[PDB]
Amino acid sequence: KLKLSNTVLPSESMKVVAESMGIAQIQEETCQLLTDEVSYRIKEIAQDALKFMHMGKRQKLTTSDIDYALKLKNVEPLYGFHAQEFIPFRFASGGGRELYFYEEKEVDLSDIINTPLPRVPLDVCLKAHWLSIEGCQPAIPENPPRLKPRSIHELSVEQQLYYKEITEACVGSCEAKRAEALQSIATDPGLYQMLPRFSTFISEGVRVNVVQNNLALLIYLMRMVKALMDNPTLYLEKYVHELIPAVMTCIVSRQLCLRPDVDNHWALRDFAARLVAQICKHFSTTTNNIQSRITKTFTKSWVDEKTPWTTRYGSIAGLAELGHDVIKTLILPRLQQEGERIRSVLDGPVLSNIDRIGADHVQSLLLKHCAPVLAKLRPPPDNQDAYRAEFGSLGPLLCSQVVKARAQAALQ
């Protein structure tokens, strides 16, 4: 079965061209005579431009194929203009005209000058790799993809040794070892079918690693989670039910080790955990299961009276990094409670506890979020004392942060 037809250009386009040139009152047989001649020349060239596509070993007819197909038929590749003498440009392609259907048809002559030129790409180089090693294709990134019998483990001993080396490197005794092991996790294609043992090693580790608050052990495990996530080959949402309560524990937990000093890292432990938490709510999303569940736990962490301030700071960070609208709809009705908590830490003399440090970190983070939440939905008018209607927390310094954001927008 082949219902192949002969499609020509419409004749009602050929009369428009003729009467817009000075040739009026053309007959239909005169006009049909134009549209079978030019539709043959389009068919003659597109069949002849398909010879250059095949010879160049491409499957896409580029714009230069018609330039050589025209030159082959002794017609100038020039499309915009036609030179009767032909001496200024003799069968020289000018690369066509960059024109569109949805174009503006008028531009300003200094708009084209002030735009940045595109980056010239890298030159052609010759790299060698292996398609086949004695018959077997390697999984390198240059390649696409009555007694019952004594059973064998589903991992090989090379794979089991690889798992042991990667896990003993990912506990961060040496930093270059970690970084390679993290890149190895980030791009091994065959890291599926080992992923249960990695997820179990992460989950089990954080839970017996918060019994004594060992910050590096945790910072290395969170980097292992981040290296597990950006791997494109492996299927993760079968294992995310173990991954998510591990990161929530890094963010919402108390620190058993020295309270101050590494709290700077503790903020990053809560910074790395809140980053991977909102990346996990970005992926793996179905209706009303993952993002709303962690949002509900973060909000009941917040509205809980008389919290640990480490847990308070971590939950504050976690609710803060959830995106544009989440701080637009959630952080709004709670400024008075935040201010009252800050006032209590300030009044009580107790300085040797961690309450004061927790309060300062929470207030700074909340004030930065409130700044763009404001820069985003209102003009920057009355930036001096109008914020005193919102208990005067960040005030003019918040206004200065908004001004810095406006300067960054101007630079963009």
């Binding site: 839970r207 995310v240 039910h241 998510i244 524990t249 919402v252 937990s253 299961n289 736990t297």
Partner: peptide, 25 residues
């Protein structure tokens, strides 16, 4: 549609919130 593979993934069928360790001791 309730036989879709996701329904049976244990993130959507497990109260994993209980695991998060708060103030453990």
């Amino acid at each position: 549609d309730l036989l879709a593979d996701e329904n049976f993934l244990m993130v959507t069928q497990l109260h994993w919130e209980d695991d998060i360790i708060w103030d453990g001791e």
